[PDB]
Amino acid sequence: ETIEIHPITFPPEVLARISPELSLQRHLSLGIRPCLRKYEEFRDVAIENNTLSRYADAGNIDTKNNILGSNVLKSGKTIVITSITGGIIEETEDIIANYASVYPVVEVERGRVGACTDEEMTISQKLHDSILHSRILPKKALKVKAGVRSANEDGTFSVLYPDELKRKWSYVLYAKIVVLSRTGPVFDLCWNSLMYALQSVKLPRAFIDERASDLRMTIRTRGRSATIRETYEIICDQTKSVPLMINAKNIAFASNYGIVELDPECQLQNLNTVLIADLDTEAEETSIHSTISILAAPSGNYKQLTLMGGGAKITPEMIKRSLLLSRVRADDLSTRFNI
């Protein structure tokens, strides 16, 4: 029986809470996003670098601060702040064994109290992985060239620094990501916020003592004995610092992508397979199942690519389209904040 079944319609804010998926399908009918965007409308990105490092004021670096090069990132409705510290262990072409990374810790303040969430525990790993796969960092950049603080005349101290070259020492760096107001996938903004913090890291001048008091000590066995080696505690300067050396031609940027397939039923007048990037907005993150995430450095380079295909097929051309959309969104951000 041909029946005019009248449906029941709602305010749109009612609908998304109810159906993440169909409210999306409403936006796809007009061809828009439930973040009010059209298909390829991308969020603005705003930073400030180096504000929270002690090396902000080049004129007067303060006393008790311990932060190397800092980064603020806001894009859309999620503010993420990146902080860099470093540590030192006593150290005793393009292949992976030349290449190291940092140790990051992310927190997502998503309201839930408790232990380390499983979303977070992936993140600090996933960055570190492609940072190794970026091949950014030869360990030559970690090689520390310490001075000795010459106990000079009438009780004054000058640190003799050697230049242009018995133990060795190595910087080991750290990161912390705080995530506020998570509205969607986070990994691209986790990536990109680090990158600007990476360029702001000064390497502080480290030095050892002229002749440290902390010398060799012996330990008696049950008849025998051995010697503890002399404990030369490295000290970083209160003042001097050098910058960081980067394989700058491999500094990537991040971008995610989503491909969906469409229902004939869901249309409202004002196959069909649509690419969306700059993904956000829980309804999107629920309902997109074939997805693409890409790292790329602006000259056509690619640190990584990440395909999870769980919804649609993937054409060879949405690939190339996302690649075409890759080298834009990255290269702008390389040129946007000119650090």
Partner: protein
């Protein structure tokens, strides 16, 4: 009446007895209004007009509630 007026008297004086921001460090980025951008076939950055999406929303509210009233079907 003067009792409540005494209250209305006394509500005067006690209520009579009661009677600029610069964001130095971080607040010039935290309540930053968000923006969206676009690229043309050149790939050059195209900032989104704020006025469009409101009209989009009023287009979105319009075709929703009106075209979803009666569904004539088999």
């Amino acid at each position: 009446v003067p009792q409540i007026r005494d209250v209305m008297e006394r509500f005067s004086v006690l209520c009579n007895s009661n009677i600029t921001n610069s964001s130095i460090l971080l607040g010039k980025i935290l309540p930053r209004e968000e923006h969206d951008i676009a690229y043309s076939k050149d790939g050059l950055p195209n900032k989104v007009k704020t006025e469009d999406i409101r009209i989009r929303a009023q287009n979105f509210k319009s075709a929703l509630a009106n075209l979803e009233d009666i569904i004539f079907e088999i």
